[PDB]
């Protein structure tokens, strides 16, 4: 039974705050009662609803992400089986979620500037044969050092890179215009859905607000599109650097 105040993993972690998740996953912020440090717990499968075969695959792909010493990805501290199935324990990222920051109407330059860290991450992960699983606004947070970060790691097996880019776009989008360009699916993200044009395709961030520079809007848009505009975290990074440089 997972709720604030609950002690977890032989009571090492007192649950603090629930930050959402895509089932079967749960993103929690909790306290390391052993070290009086804070952490991001990701309960892989709390309801043990997964084929215990599968849960292995997830946990194994995820552990690969621990390799990566990027700023894009919150560092994985420990992995374990608890009363509540699989559980990833990564570092706590000081700052606020995606929701939280989207909601402060940030500079479209700052936005795409920050977001670079997370394409950096996602590219490295990719070059290393592993997706970030950018699937829900909740997964992401922004650090007081001005970095976008996969805060709750757990690469699912269905997870792929094409979708990491798509989802990374949705993250840029959501900062610029404060909306989720994707369907969502799980915890009400906190982010209100994107306005679908007469076509159904979400509406470009600049068409929605003229102070959002050309490229910066363009980047975010082509990203999400499944056509799609961009085909590598690699290039997508330089796109961000382009768009960003221009405003500079």
UniProtKB/Swiss-Prot annotation:
Post-translational modification summary for this protein: Phosphorylated by PknB. Phosphorylation recruits FhaA.
Keyword Metal-binding: no
Molecular function terms from GO: lipid-linked peptidoglycan transporter activity
Major localisation: membrane
Subcellular location: Cell membrane
Keywords: Acetylation, Cell membrane, Cell shape, Membrane, Peptidoglycan synthesis, Phosphoprotein, Transmembrane, Transmembrane helix
Keyword Phosphoprotein tagged: yes
GO cellular component term, pick one: extracellular region
GO biological process: lipid translocation; lipid-linked peptidoglycan transport; peptidoglycan biosynthetic process; regulation of cell shape
Signal peptide limits: none
Membership in a protein family: In the N-terminal section; belongs to the MurJ/MviN family.
Domain description: The extendend C-terminal region contains a kinase-like region, which encodes a catalytically inactive pseudokinase, and an extracellular region reminiscent of carbohydrate-binding proteins.
Protein's job: Essential for cell growth and peptidoglycan synthesis.
Quaternary structure and interacting proteins, as annotated: Homodimer. Interacts with the FHA domain of FhaA.
Protein name stated in the entry: Probable peptidoglycan biosynthesis protein MviN
């Amino acid at each position: 039974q997972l709720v604030p105040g609950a002690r977890i993993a032989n009571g090492r972690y007192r649950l603090l705050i629930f930050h959402g998740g895509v089932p079967p996953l749960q993103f929690w912020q909790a306290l390391d009662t052993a070290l009086d440090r804070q952490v991001a717990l990701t309960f892989v499968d709390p309801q043990g609803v997964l084929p215990d075969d599968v849960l292995q695959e997830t946990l194994s792909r995820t552990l690969r992400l621990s390799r990566i010493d990027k700023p894009g990805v919150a560092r994985v501290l420990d992995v374990v089986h608890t009363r509540a199935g699989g559980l990833v324990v990564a570092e706590w990222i000081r700052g606020g979620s995606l929701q939280e920051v989207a909601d402060t109407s940030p500079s479209p330059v700052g936005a795409i500037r920050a977001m670079q860290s997370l394409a950096a991450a996602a590219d490295a992960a990719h070059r290393a044969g592993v997706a970030l699983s950018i699937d829900h606004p909740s997964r992401v947070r922004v650090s007081i050092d001005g970095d976008v970060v996969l805060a709750y790691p757990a690469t699912m097996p269905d997870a792929n890179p094409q979708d990491d880019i798509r989802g990374i776009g949705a993250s840029l989008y959501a900062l610029l215009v404060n909306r989720w360009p994707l369907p969502e699916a799980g915890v009400r993200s906190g982010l209100a859905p994107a306005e679908r044009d007469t076509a159904g395709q979400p509406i470009e961030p600049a068409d929605i607000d003229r102070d959002i520079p050309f490229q910066i809007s363009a980047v975010a848009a082509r990203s999400v599109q499944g056509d799609g505009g961009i085909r590598s975290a690699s290039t997508l990074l330089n796109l961000m650097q382009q768009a960003t440089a221009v405003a500079d």
